[PDB]
Design an enzyme around this catalytic site. Structure first.
Site, PDB file in Angstrom:
ATOM      1  N   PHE A   1      43.719  30.550  41.111  1.00 25.92           N
ATOM      2  CA  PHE A   1      44.758  30.708  42.132  1.00 25.92           C
ATOM      3  C   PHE A   1      44.310  29.819  43.300  1.00 25.92           C
ATOM      4  O   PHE A   1      43.219  29.241  43.257  1.00 25.92           O
ATOM      5  CB  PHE A   1      44.848  32.167  42.612  1.00 25.92           C
ATOM      6  CG  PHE A   1      45.359  33.123  41.574  1.00 25.92           C
ATOM      7  CD1 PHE A   1      44.840  34.408  41.485  1.00 25.92           C
ATOM      8  CD2 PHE A   1      46.351  32.741  40.684  1.00 25.92           C
ATOM      9  CE1 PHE A   1      45.300  35.301  40.519  1.00 25.92           C
ATOM     10  CE2 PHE A   1      46.820  33.626  39.712  1.00 25.92           C
ATOM     11  CZ  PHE A   1      46.288  34.909  39.633  1.00 25.92           C
TER      12      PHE A   1
ATOM     13  N   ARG B   1      43.733  46.743  36.611  1.00 26.45           N
ATOM     14  CA  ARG B   1      44.006  45.885  37.763  1.00 26.45           C
ATOM     15  C   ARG B   1      42.816  46.147  38.685  1.00 26.45           C
ATOM     16  O   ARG B   1      42.872  47.017  39.559  1.00 26.45           O
ATOM     17  CB  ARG B   1      45.308  46.289  38.466  1.00 26.45           C
ATOM     18  CG  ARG B   1      46.575  46.013  37.661  1.00 26.45           C
ATOM     19  CD  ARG B   1      46.705  44.527  37.318  1.00 26.45           C
ATOM     20  NE  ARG B   1      48.050  44.216  36.848  1.00 26.45           N
ATOM     21  CZ  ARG B   1      48.447  43.035  36.388  1.00 26.45           C
ATOM     22  NH1 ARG B   1      47.606  42.013  36.311  1.00 26.45           N
ATOM     23  NH2 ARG B   1      49.712  42.872  36.030  1.00 26.45           N
TER      24      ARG B   1
ATOM     25  N   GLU C   1      41.065  40.734  25.553  1.00 26.08           N
ATOM     26  CA  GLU C   1      40.286  41.088  26.742  1.00 26.08           C
ATOM     27  C   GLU C   1      40.792  40.516  28.063  1.00 26.08           C
ATOM     28  O   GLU C   1      40.325  40.878  29.150  1.00 26.08           O
ATOM     29  CB  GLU C   1      38.831  40.691  26.529  1.00 26.08           C
ATOM     30  CG  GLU C   1      38.227  41.349  25.318  1.00 26.08           C
ATOM     31  CD  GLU C   1      36.729  41.403  25.394  1.00 26.08           C
ATOM     32  OE1 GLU C   1      36.119  41.924  24.445  1.00 26.08           O
ATOM     33  OE2 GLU C   1      36.158  40.931  26.398  1.00 26.08           O
TER      34      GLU C   1
END
Lengths: 202, 201
Positions: free
Chosen positions: A22, A72, A155
């Site tokens: 990112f 998350r 994964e």
């Protein structure tokens, strides 16, 4: 309501502070203030991670919603567990449309072949620090066909599908058991439009 | 011993181990790399996983609602990150602010209501706490409904907008209000407005 637009903004420059999977960009700009004058130069660190397509899997006949469970890690520090109950979703690549990303992800993540789809709402997750926009689609699904756990795991994306009644999914949102923006918005929207959606897809 | 907490999910914090966090970039906001291993649904432990996480703190959000006049008070301000995917970067939002050390969500919400919208909030009620986008950021935002007298609302960076609840909601439906905090709060309000109005009658 809002009257100021892009001509009331002067983007001086943009820079990438960090670029990996990112990016973290710095926007340097001036903008019109509500008294009509222009501001000094303002600096803002923005999180750049593309945009998402979200799909609310809804079975009209059974009045059920399909939820996907996955970890998350970012939720870790402020939640009781990093494994969240979510909507089907995926990043919009190249020139993909929100509908095709949503439909493709329903297959990969839930093993569901969406029938009819309808756009819902498109939202900015957190305009103050990230440019990310998420577009929600509600997709007609047959909940009885969701896939199970994968024997050989992915994964990078290990998912467990959960099928619950629409009413219970909504209650979990009210209770904070489902608390990620995309799911809250999608399920609140469903709660506000389910009878009309059911009638339409009946 | 005490029984474990109930979870609507399969695994909890004891099922993941965080190896370490490495800072990728430090500014007032940071980008970190979480390295961890976690149980997989097939019963096996994963290999190390690396994720970049945007760390920008957490926020308190306040939906200013006048139950008697059935109005909402919105604030307008530029959010440059909205530039690339919106017609205009000026957005209609809820009163909001970052929660700092030793401050409750209610403290922040009440303070921000005064400096952003010149509002003195009366009763407050917790609505919902949400994760903005857990796949990339840790940001959590807690929403509360603040009882206000919409007539007392009141700036070079933030403009106040008093509209009916129906107008605000219709704007969410048409996409004119599309930031997560406002959409969630106004959808919540649309679903609970009569009950709330009765509670505060």
């Amino acid at each position: 309501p809002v009257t100021f637009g892009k001509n009331d903004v002067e983007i001086i420059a943009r820079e990438t502070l960090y670029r990996g999977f990112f990016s973290l960009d710095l926007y340097r700009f001036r903008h019109r203030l509500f008294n009509g004058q222009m501001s000094h130069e303002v600096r803002r660190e923005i999180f750049e991670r593309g945009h998402a397509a979200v799909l609310l899997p809804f079975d009209p006949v059974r009045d059920e919603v399909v939820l996907i469970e996955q970890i998350r890690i970012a939720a870790y520090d402020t939640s009781e567990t990093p494994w969240l109950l979510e909507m089907v979703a995926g990043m919009i690549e190249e020139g993909e449309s929100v509908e095709d990303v949503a439909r493709r992800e329903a297959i990969e993540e839930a093993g569901l072949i969406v029938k009819r789809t309808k756009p819902v709402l498109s939202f900015l997750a957190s305009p103050g620090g990230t440019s990310e926009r998420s577009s929600i689609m509600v997709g007609e699904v047959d909940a009885t066909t969701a896939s199970g756990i994968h024997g050989l795991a992915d994964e990078n994306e290990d998912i467990r599908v959960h099928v619950v009644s629409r009413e219970q999914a909504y209650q979990w949102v009210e209770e904070g058991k489902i608390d990620n923006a995309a799911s809250v918005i999608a399920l609140q929207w469903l709660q506000l439009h389910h009878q009309a959606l059911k009638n339409e897809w009946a």
